C-alpha cells in the first residue's frame, strides 16, 4: 500500500512497508560511508596524523584537519543512520533483515526509537552480524577518541566547507557508535528463521525468507497477504558462490518487487578481479613487499582465501605467511565451518564426508594462514616481513588496517589491495594520501549486475517495480551507459531518502473460509458459472474471517 524510504543508500536500505494492517521494516542499513569524512582512528598515536595542519574558515581549526588538500573531521567517525523520524518506529511491528551487512544500525532502531516489535533474520546473518558488530564496537572503543567536533555540522558552516565535507547529507542525524550492551539488547529480540519458513504475522500477512546467494545466510523476503504478494529482493548473487543459490521461482507472480543491493561499480567482472588480486599479491610478495587487504572478517574473504589457497601452490608462495588479524577472526572461521547447511550443494556435499566445508580450514592445520585476535598479543612474535595481512575495517578509519598503513605506507614495495566495493577507494586513501604504497583497487562485488537483473525481471514479471533513484539513472562515474540502469515495461518506481511511495496495487478479495454447515445451506443455482444467495454472520478472529450460519 505505502512504502516509506528511510535510507537513500542503494546497497544499505531501510524501507518501511505499510502493508494492510501490519507495518514491516525491510532491512536496516547503517551508512558507514559517513565515516570517510573523519580522521582515522589509530591503535597508537601516530606522529603524522597527530600534527596534521588545521584547516581555517574565515568566519573550527581544532575540529578540522587538512591532509593533502582534503579536510577531515578530527572527531570519532560517526555513522549515518536510517532516518528514524518520518514514521514513528513504535508503529512498526516486524523488522525483516536480509544481510548481516544490512543488520547494522539495528541497535539504533531497537533501542533509541521505542521499537517494541520483533525482528526476523536467519541464523548466519544474526551470528555473523553479531561478530561484525562486536568488532565495530571493539574498533571504536580500543583507543577512545572523543566526540569533540560539533560546529562543522551547521547549515551555515557546511555550505562553506570544501566538496567532500559539503556534500555530506543528513549530518545532524549522524551518531556515535553504539555500545556492546545495545548490541546484546538488539540481538536478544531477534526471532531466528530458516529458508522457506512461513512466518504468520498476526494472521494478516505471511513472510518467508528465500535464499539470495550473496552471503551465507543472506535472504530475500516475500510478504504475502492473501491474494497479493510483495517481493523484497535485497543483495543477491547469481554467480557460483558458496551459499545456497538464489531462489528465483518463489519471487514469481508478485504485485510489487522492491529491489535493493545491486552491484556497485557494475563494470567489473568479479572473476577477473579475483585474478587481478591474486596476480598483484603474487607480484608484491615476489618482490619482497607486503600485501595489506582491508576486508570484512566474513564474506568475500572466504572466496579470496579459497582462490589464494588454489593459487599459492601454483605460484610457489608457500613461504609467504597469510595473517588474518581481527577480534572476531577465529569466530568468523569457526562460524563459516559450522554453517554448512546454508551453503551451496557443492559445499554441503563436503560435510557428508567427514570434511570441513570451507577449504580455508586446511590452511590453519597446514599453518599457511594464521589468525590472531589483535596485533599486540602474539602476532608481534610470529611476524615475518614478506607477508599478506587481511585485517581492519575496509573503511580505513578504524581497526588494525590503520596501524598497518601507517607502518607500511612509506615503502613502494608494499601494496594495499582493495576488494570491498562498499567504500570509495579515493576517499579511503585520502587521509593517508602522501604514501609511496601502490594501491590496487579490484572490487569483488558478486551481487546482481544490470543484465542479470534484467534477465531476472524478465523471468519473474512483477506487476510493479520499486527501486532506488540511483538505479534508474546511469551511474555518475559513467553517466552515459544506458545499459547500466533498470529498464522494465512499466518504467519502475524510483525513491530517494525520506520519500513516501504510494503503491496503487491494493486490491479487493480478501480470502475467507466457510464451514460445511453453511456450505450445505447454499443452493448452487444455475446461471451459466453458478450463483447462490448467502445469509451468514461474520466471525473474525486473529485477522482471519469465518462465515457462520445464523
Amino acid at each position: 500500500m505505502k512504502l516509506y524510504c528511510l535510507s537513500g543508500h542503494p546497497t544499505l536500505p531501510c524501507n518501511v512497508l505499510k502493508f494492510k494492517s501490519t507495518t514491516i521494516m525491510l532491512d536496516c542499513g547503517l551508512d558507514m560511508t559517513s565515516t570517510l569524512n573523519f580522521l582515522p582512528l589509530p591503535l597508537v598515536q601516530s606522529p603524522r596524523l597527530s600534527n596534521l595542519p588545521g584547516w581555517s574558515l574565515k568566519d573550527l581549526d581544532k575540529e578540522l584537519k587538512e591532509c593533502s588538500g582534503h579536510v577531515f573531521v578530527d572527531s570519532v567517525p560517526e555513522f549515518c543512520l536510517p532516518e528514524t523520524e518520518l514514521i514513528d518506529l513504535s508503529t512498526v511491528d516486524v523488522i525483516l533483515i536480509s544481510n548481516y551487512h544490512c543488520m547494522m544500525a539495528l541497535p539504533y532502531i531497537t533501542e533509541h526509537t521505542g521499537f517494541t516489535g520483533t525482528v526476523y533474520a536467519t541464523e548466519p546473518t544474526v551470528q555473523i552480524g553479531r561478530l561484525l558488530m562486536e568488532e565495530l564496537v571493539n574498533f571504536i572503543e580500543r583507543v577512545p577518541k572523543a566526540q569533540s567536533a560539533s560546529l562543522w555540522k551547521n547549515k551555515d558552516i557546511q555550505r562553506l566547507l570544501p566538496s567532500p565535507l559539503k556534500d555530506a547529507v543528513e549530518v545532524s542525524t549522524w551518531r556515535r557508535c553504539y555500545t556492546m550492551q545495545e548490541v546484546n539488547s538488539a540481538l536478544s529480540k531477534i526471532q531466528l528463521v530458516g529458508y522457506s519458513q512461513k512466518i504468520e504475522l498476526f494472521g494478516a500477512v505471511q513472510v518467508t525468507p528465500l535464499s539470495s546467494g550473496y552471503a551465507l545466510g543472506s535472504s530475500n523476503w516475500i510478504i504475502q497477504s492473501h491474494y497479493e504478494k510483495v517481493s523484497y529482493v535485497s543483495g543477491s548473487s547469481l554467480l557460483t558462490t558458496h551459499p545456497q543459490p538464489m531462489d528465483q521461482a518463489s519471487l514469481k507472480n508478485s504485485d510489487v518487487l522492491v529491489l535493493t543491493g545491486l552491484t556497485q561499480i557494475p563494470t567489473a567482472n568479479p572473476d577477473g578481479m579475483v585474478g587481478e588480486f591474486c596476480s598483484n599479491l603474487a607480484l608484491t610478495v615476489r618482490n619482497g613487499g607486503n600485501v595489506l587487504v582491508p576486508c570484512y572478517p566474513s564474506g568475500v574473504i572466504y572466496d579470496l582465501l579459497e582462490c589464494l589457497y588454489q593459487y599459492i601452490d601454483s605460484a610457489g608462495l608457500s613461504s609467504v605467511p597469510l595473517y588474518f588479524i581481527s577480534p572476531v577472526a577465529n569466530s568468523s572461521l569457526e562460524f563459516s565451518q559450522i554453517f554448512a547447511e546454508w551453503l551451496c550443494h557443492n559445499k554441503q556435499s563436503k560435510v557428508y564426508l567427514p570434511e570441513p566445508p570451507f577449504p580455508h580450514a586446511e590452511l590453519i592445520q597446514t599453518n599457511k594462514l594464521k589468525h590472531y585476535p589483535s596485533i599486540h598479543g602474539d602476532f608481534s612474535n610470529d611476524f615475518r616481513q614478506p607477508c599478506v595481512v587481511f585485517t581492519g575495517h575496509p573503511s580505513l578509519r578504524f581497526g588494525d588496517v590503520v596501524h598497518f598503513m601507517e607502518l607500511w605506507g612509506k615503502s613502494s614495495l608494499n601494496t594495499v589491495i582493495f576488494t570491498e566495493p562498499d567504500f570509495s577507494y579515493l576517499e579511503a586513501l585520502a587521509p593517508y594520501q602522501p604514501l609511496a604504497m601502490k594501491c590496487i583497487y579490484c572490487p569483488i562485488d558478486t551481487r546482481l549486475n544490470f543484465i542479470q537483473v534484467s534477465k531476472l525481471l524478465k523471468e519473474v514479471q512483477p506487476l510493479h517495480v520499486v527501486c532506488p533513484e540511483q538505479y534508474t539513472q546511469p551511474p555518475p562515474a559513467q553517466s552515459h551507459r544506458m545499459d547500466l540502469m533498470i529498464d522494465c515495461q512499466p518504467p519502475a518506481m524510483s525513491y530517494r531518502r525520506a520519500e513516501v511511495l504510494a503503491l496503487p496495487f491494493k486490491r479487493r478479495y480478501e480470502k475467507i473460509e466457510i464451514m460445511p454447515e453453511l456450505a450445505d445451506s447454499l443452493v448452487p443455482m444455475e446461471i451459466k458459472i453458478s450463483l447462490a444467495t448467502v445469509s451468514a454472520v461474520l466471525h473474525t478472529k486473529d485477522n482471519k474471517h469465518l462465515l457462520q450460519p445464523p
Binding site: 505505502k2 591503535l43 611476524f383 486473529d542
Partner: protein, 820 residues
C-alpha cells in the same frame, strides 16, 4: 523563525519537499512561546494539505512539541480534538492520539482535560483500524477515571491480538497507577490465558498475577466441580500451567510471577515439586528446561517460596542438590546462593552433605566461594559429617591454597554454630596422644590454623571442655588471637589543626623572615599531622599547600630583584619567576585533586591564582624593554580580574583588605593608568595585601592514584616486533576521585620526546566502593627498533577544564622492540 517556517511551508511546494522541511525542522528545540506560535502555524497548515503523509508528520511534530519542557500544553488541546473531529486517515489519527496521550501525560493534575481525553478515546475506540484502537486503549490506561474497566474488559476479546495486548497492558497500567481492579477481570484473563499469541499470553499471565495479589483470599468455584478454591491458589495453578508454555520468555515470566505468590496454600506448594491439579510438577519441569534463563527464574521462584514457607525448603533441598551440577555456571551459582538463603533451620543428611562436599572440588573459584558461604550458613547434625566437611575443606585448601581466608571463615562459622558436635572430634583433630608428649605443630601451616579456627570457635560457646588443649595449643591460641583476631574469639588533631591555622592567621604582622619561619613550621606540622591522623590527611595537606602558596608568594615578594633597576635585572639568578609558576601549579592541584571543595574554598583558590598571575605579570614586566607586550599582558591581567569580579561577585564582601578588593578600589584609576605605573602599583600593593582565611571543609580527601599491574620492579623486557604493537595492562587504585570517567587519563612517555596521552573509556572505570575506583585499561605501545631495551614511562594524569597535572606515582616498564 516561526514566520520562516510559515513561508517555507506555504511557499516552496505542497506535496513532497514540505515533508522534507518538516523533517529538518523537527530536529531542533523550540522555546515555549515559539512552541505556541509554531503550533498555531502548523495547525493552520494542517487543513490546507490533503496529503496524508504530510499530515502524519504534522501530527508527530505536534506530539514532539507538546513534550517540550517549559511549554504548558493546556491551550492547544481544543484545536487538537478539533482536528481529530474531521480526520479520516487512520495512521494520522493514531499519531494524533499519540499526541493527545503526550498532552494528557504532561498534565496529570487537570482532571477536566483528562476526562475530555478519555471521552475522546472512548469515542474513537470503535475505529476499524487496530492502531487507533491500540492508541485509544493506551490513552485510557494512562489517564482513566481514577466505566474504564468495563470498556477495557470488553476489548480483551477483540479479534486482533495486538489490541488484546494493548487492553491488558492498559488495565495493568491502570492498576500500576493506583486503580483497584474488579474480579471479573480474573475470569476474562483466565479465558485469555490460552491465547494463540505469545504477547497476549504473557500480558494475561501478568494480569492474572496482579488480580491474584489484589484478592488472594477471595473464594471462586471450580467450573467442573462443587468444591471451592481460594483465588490465589487457582491463579497459582494457572501460572504453574503457564510454566509449561511453548515460549521460553513466557516460561521465564511465569516462573518470576510464581515466585511472588507467597499467599498460596501449602498443599499446592507440595504439589508443585512432586513428580507423580495443574500445578503438579511445575517447578520440576522448570528446573530441567532447555533454556537456562527459565531454570534461573525457577531457582529464584524456589528461593522466594521457600523463604515464605519453611516446610517448602525441605522439598527444595534435594532439587537444589541435584541442580548444583548444572551445565551453566550462572545457574549453579544461583542454586548455591539460594540454597544458602533457605538453609535457615533445616539440617543436611549424609548424601546431600557429601554431594555438596564433592562439588566443593570444582576448579571455578566463584562457585567455590559461593559454596564456602553456603557451608558458613549450613546446619548439620551427625558429627562424622562435620569431620567429613573438615576433611573436604582441608583437601580443598591443599588443592587451592588461595582460598585459605574463605576456608577459615567456613571453619569459624562451623565451629561457632555446631559446638557440641566438634567437641568429641577434638582428640582426632589435634594429634593428642593420651600419654605421649606430642610435638608442637608447625605454626603458619594453613591446614593447622584451619583446624584450630574450627576448634577455638567451638570452644567459645562451650566452656565445658577447654582443658583438652595442650600447652602448645594454648600458645598457638595466643598467637592466633594476636594475628587472626577477626576469626578466633576470646578530637585533639582537629583542634591542633585549627590552632595552627589561627596561629598562622593571627601572626600576619611579623617581619618577612618571621613569617617565612612561621609558615615553614606550620607546613611541617601539617605534613606530619597528615602522616599521623589518616582521616585529617586531606585537609592537612590542603592547608599545607595553601600555606606553601603563601610562603612562595612571601619569598618571591622579598627578592633581591626589587632592589635593582629594570636594566640591571638579571634572570639567571631569578627566584620569583619559578615561584609564580609553582603557585599556579599548587592552585590547580588544590582545586582539582581535592574532593570536598566548594565555592567558599574555590574563591580563595582563585584569589591565590590571581595573586600568582599578578606576580608573574610583574616578573615579566621586569625583563621587558618594549612597551606594547607589557601593555598587552597588563590588559590581559585586568581582563582576568574583571572576569573574577564578574564570576565571584556574591562573596566579594567577605574578602576584606585582600588583593582583589583593594584592586577594586583603585580599578577606575587602573583602566586610566599607564601600564608601567600599573606594574609598580601592583608590586607595591602585593606587599600590602592581607593574607586570606581558608574555610575548612567538613569532609575533604586527596585524590590518590597508584598503579600495580605494570609493577615497575621487574627488569625483564617486554619484547615485540618493531613497528608492531605491544599491550600493557594497568590496574589503578583511584581513591577519592570525584569524576574519574572524564578526569583520569593515562600518560605513556617513551624514552624520546613522545608523550602519548590515553583517554580511558568509561566502561572500565570500575567502582567497587564509595570513593574507591578501579581502572583496568589495556594501553598500547609501539615504536621502531631499539638497539637496547630502554624503558617507558607510564603515569596517570588528572585533566581539568585546559591542562593536566601529575596524579600517580611514576612507573617504569621495560620495552624491547626487536627488528622483524
Amino acid at each position: 523563525k516561526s514566520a520562516a517556517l510559515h513561508i517555507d511551508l506555504c511557499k516552496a511546494t505542497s506535496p513532497a519537499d514540505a515533508l522534507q522541511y518538516l523533517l529538518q525542522f523537527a530536529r531542533k528545540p523550540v522555546e515555549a512561546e515559539s512552541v505556541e506560535g509554531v503550533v498555531r502555524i502548523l495547525l493552520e497548515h494542517y487543513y490546507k494539505e490533503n496529503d496524508p503523509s504530510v499530515r502524519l508528520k504534522i501530527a508527530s511534530l505536534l506530539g514532539l512539541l507538546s513534550k517540550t519542557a517549559g511549554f504548558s500544553p493546556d491551550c492547544i488541546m481544543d484545536d487538537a480534538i478539533n482536528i481529530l473531529q474531521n480526520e479520516k486517515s487512520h495512521q494520522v489519527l493514531a499519531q494524533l492520539l499519540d499526541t493527545l496521550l503526550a498532552i494528557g501525560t504532561k498534565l496529570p493534575e487537570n482532571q477536566a482535560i483528562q476526562m475530555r481525553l478519555v471521552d475522546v478515546a472512548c469515542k474513537h475506540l470503535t475505529d476499524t483500524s487496530h492502531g487507533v484502537r491500540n492508541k485509544c486503549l493506551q490513552l485510557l490506561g494512562n489517564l482513566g477515571s481514577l466505566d474504564v474497566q468495563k470498556i477495557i474488559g470488553d476489548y480483551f476479546s477483540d479479534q486482533d491480538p495486538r489490541v488484546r495486548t494493548a487492553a491488558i497492558k492498559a488495565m495493568l497500567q491502570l492498576h500500576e497507577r493506583g486503580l483497584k481492579l474488579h474480579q471479573t477481570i480474573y475470569n476474562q484473563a483466565c479465558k485469555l490465558l490460552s491465547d494463540d499469541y505469545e504477547q497476549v499470553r504473557s500480558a494475561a499471565v501478568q494480569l492474572i498475577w496482579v488480580v491474584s495479589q489484589l484478592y488472594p483470599e477471595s473464594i471462586v468455584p471450580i467450573p467442573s466441580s462443587n468444591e471451592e478454591i481460594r483465588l490465589v491458589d487457582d491463579a497459582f495453578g494457572k501460572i504453574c500451567h503457564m510454566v509449561s508454555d511453548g515460549s521460553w520468555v513466557v516460561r521465564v515470566q511465569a516462573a518470576k510471577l510464581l515466585g511472588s505468590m507467597e499467599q498460596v496454600s501449602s498443599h499446592f506448594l507440595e504439589q508443585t515439586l512432586d513428580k507423580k491439579s495443574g500445578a503438579c510438577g511445575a517447578f520440576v519441569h522448570g528446573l530441567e528446561d532447555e533454556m537456562y534463563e527459565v531454570r534461573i527464574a525457577a531457582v529464584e521462584a524456589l528461593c522466594m517460596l521457600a523463604q515464605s514457607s519453611p516446610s517448602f525448603a525441605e522439598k527444595c533441598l534435594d532439587f537444589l542438590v541435584d541442580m548444583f551440577n548444572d551445565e551453566i555456571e550462572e545457574v549453579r551459582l544461583q542454586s548455591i546462593h539460594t540454597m544458602r538463603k533457605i538453609s535457615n533451620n533445616i539440617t543436611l543428611r549424609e548424601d546431600q552433605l557429601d554431594t555438596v562436599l564433592a562439588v566443593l572440588e570444582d576448579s571455578s573459584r566463584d562457585i567455590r566461594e559461593a559454596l564456602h558461604e553456603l557451608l558458613c550458613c549450613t546446619n548439620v547434625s551427625t558429627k562424622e559429617g562435620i569431620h567429613l566437611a573438615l576433611v573436604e575443606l582441608l583437601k580443598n585448601l591443599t588443592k587451592y591454597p588461595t582460598d585459605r581466608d574463605s576456608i577459615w571463615k567456613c571453619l569459624k562459622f562451623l565451629g561457632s554454630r555446631h559446638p557440641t558436635l566438634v567437641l568429641p572430634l577434638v582428640p582426632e583433630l589435634l594429634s593428642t596422644h593420651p600419654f605421649f608428649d606430642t610435638a608442637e605443630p608447625d605454626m603458619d601451616d594453613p591446614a593447622y590454623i584451619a583446624v584450630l579456627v574450627l576448634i577455638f570457635n567451638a570452644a567459645k560457646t562451650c566452656p565445658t571442655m577447654p582443658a583438652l588443649f595442650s600447652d602448645h595449643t594454648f600458645r598457638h591460641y595466643a598467637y592466633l588471637r594476636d594475628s587472626l583476631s577477626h576469626l578466633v574469639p576470646a578530637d585533639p588533631s582537629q583542634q591542633f589543626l585549627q590552632q595552627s591555622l589561627e596561629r598562622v592567621y593571627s601572626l600576619q604582622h611579623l617581619d618577612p623572615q618571621g613569617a617565612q619561619e612561621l609558615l615553614e613550621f606550620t607546613i611541617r606540622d601539617l605534613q606530619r599531622l597528615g602522616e599521623l591522623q589518616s582521616e585529617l590527611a586531606g585537609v592537612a595537606d590542603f592547608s599545607a599547600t595553601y600555606l606553601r602558596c603563601q610562603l612562595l608568594l612571601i619569598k618571591a615578594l622579598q627578592e633581591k630583584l626589587w632592589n635593582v633597576a629594570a636594566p640591571l635585572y638579571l634572570k639567571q639568578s631569578d627566584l620569583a619567576s619559578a615561584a609564580a609558576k609553582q603557585i599556579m601549579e599548587e592552585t590547580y592541584k588544590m582545586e582539582f585533586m581535592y574532593s570536598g571543595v566548594e565555592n567558599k574554598q574555590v574563591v580563595i583558590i582563585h584569589h591565590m591564582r590571581l595573586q600568582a598571575k599578578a606576580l608573574q605579570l610583574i616578573v615579566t614586566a621586569r625583563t621587558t624593554r618594549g612597551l606594547d607586550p607589557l601593555f598587552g599582558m597588563c590588559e590581559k591581567f585586568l581582563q582576568e580580574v574583571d572576569f573574577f569580579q564578574r564570576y565571584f561577585i556574591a562573596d566579594l564582601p567577605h574578602l576584606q583588605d585582600s588583593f582583589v578588593d583593594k584592586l577594586l578600589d583603585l580599578m577606575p584609576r587602573l583602566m586610566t593608568s599607564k601600564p608601567a605605573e600599573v606594574v609598580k602599583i601592583l608590586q607595591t600593593m602585593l606587599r600590602q595585601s592581607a593574607f586570606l582565611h581558608l574555610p575548612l571543609p567538613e569532609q575533604i580527601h586527596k585524590a590518590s592514584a597508584t598503579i600495580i599491574e605494570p609493577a615497575g620492579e621487574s627488569d625483564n623486557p617486554l619484547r615485540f616486533t618493531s613497528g608492531l604493537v605491544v599491550a600493557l595492562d594497568v590496574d589503578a587504585t583511584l581513591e577519592h576521585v570525584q569524576d574519574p570517567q572524564n578526569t583520569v587519563k593515562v600518560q605513556v612517555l617513551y624514552p624520546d620526546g613522545q608523550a602519548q596521552m590515553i583517554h580511558p573509556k568509561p566502561a572500565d572505570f570500575r567502582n567497587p566502593g564509595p570513593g574507591r575506583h578501579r581502572l583496568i585499561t589495556q594501553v598500547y605501545l609501539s615504536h621502531t627498533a631499539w638497539t637496547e631495551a630502554c624503558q617507558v614511562e607510564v603515569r596517570l594524569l588528572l585533566a581539568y577544564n585546559e591542562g593536566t597535572i601529575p596524579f600517580s606515582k611514576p612507573v617504569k616498564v621495560y620495552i624491547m622492540p626487536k627488528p622483524a
